[PDB]
């Protein structure tokens, strides 16, 4: 898999998994989150050539249709396979709140 | 940065005092605030608190000032207020202006020795 | 109404040593990874200072020697290196429901 570890190891121009931190109040404006202040969402960016972690079949064939008729423009997209949760605490007035947020952290990255 | 500069201190018993905390170099606006008490030799007590305008200034007392002391705010000028009223002898302590974002109480003034006598 | 007690109600210890003192919670003051007991030291004439918030997390400008650990109703203030400068009442206060209560107060005397 493109994930973590395959990724931020040997630095590709393709599909892969790339670091990015969130600040909630400075990148967001989000004032309301007391833990974290931020967090490492990351994202995935790069070209899907033909074999490179293809998610259907579509995914395949399209890899192929695009590295042969490079003109084509329809390439499968870097998007992300595996998403971790995000465990939050903030204050309603003075009661505190935890809320585990789904899917917050990009893992790993796929061609779809 | 942070300053929390309080004032007012200082009053007979069953009289009315009036404290005022100045406060800058942070987003006061947006945290909620305290008046946090220490009596001679005594711990510390959490008498007032209120919270910010997006949480309709909601407040709650110490059972010991309730119906008595009255906490105020005005974010324009980033001020913090106690109207203390029918004052009581055990009342007299210092009181320290003190602000939470979350749950810990971050920055906190030098006080305010308040006598009733 | 958590009621928080200190132990001990006071300590005489040496320049240099290892110190460690707990905050006892009545009730958990825990809500999922988040130990919401907080520690501040306060010098003889001079409004009590945040260490310690979430039991573990060093407040800006906290000595490296000022360490936290804690959960549930169990929570340890650690000073690795004790200082004159150490010389204060040091109070827990926890932030799990209103009102938010302080514990007793752990006095450290110094012996040289």
């Known amino acids: 898999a493109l994930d973590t570890n395959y990724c931020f190891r040997n630095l590709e121009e393709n599909c892969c998994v790339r670091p990015l931190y969130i600040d909630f109040r400075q990148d967001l404006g989000w004032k309301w989150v007391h833990e974290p202040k931020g967090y490492y969402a990351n994202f995935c960016s790069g070209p899907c050539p033909y074999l490179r972690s293809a998610d259907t079949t579509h995914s395949t064939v399209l890899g192929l249709y695009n590295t042969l008729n490079p003109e084509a423009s329809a390439s499968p997209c870097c998007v992300p396979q595996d998403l971790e949760p995000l465990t939050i605490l903030y204050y309603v007035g003075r009661t505190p709140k935890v809320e585990q947020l789904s899917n917050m952290v990009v893992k790993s990255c796929k061609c779809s | 940065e942070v300053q929390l500069l309080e004032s007012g201190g200082g009053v007979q018993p069953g009289g009315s005092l009036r404290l005022s905390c100045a406060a800058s170099?942070?987003?006061?606006?947006?945290?909620?605030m305290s008046w946090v008490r220490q009596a001679p030799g005594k711990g510390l007590e959490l008498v007032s608190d209120?919270?910010?305008?997006?949480?309709?200034?909601?407040?709650y007392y110490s059972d010991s000032v309730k119906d008595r002391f009255t906490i105020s705010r005005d974010d324009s000028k980033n001020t913090l207020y106690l109207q203390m009223n029918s004052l009581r002898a055990e009342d007299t302590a210092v009181y320290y202006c003190?602000?939470?974002?979350?749950?810990?109480?971050?920055?906190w003034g030098q006080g305010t020795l308040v006598t009733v006598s | 109404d958590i009621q928080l007690t200190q132990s001990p109600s006071s300590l005489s210890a040496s320049v240099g040593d290892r110190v460690t003192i707990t905050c006892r919670a009545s009730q958990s003051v825990s809500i999922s990874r988040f130990n919401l007991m907080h520690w501040y030291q306060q010098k003889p004439g001079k409004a009590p200072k945040l260490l310690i918030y979430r039991a573990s997390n060093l407040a800006s400008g906290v000595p490296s020697r000022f360490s936290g650990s804690g959960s549930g109703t169990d929570f340890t203030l650690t000073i690795s290196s004790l200082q004159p400068e150490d010389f204060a009442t040091y109070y827990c206060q926890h932030s799990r429901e209103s009102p938010w209560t302080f514990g007793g107060g752990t006095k450290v005397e110094i012996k040289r």
């Open positions: 170099g942070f987003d006061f606006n947006s945290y909620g």
């Open positions: 209120i919270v910010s305008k997006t949480y309709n200034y909601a407040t």
């Open positions: 003190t602000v939470a974002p979350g749950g810990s109480f971050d920055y």
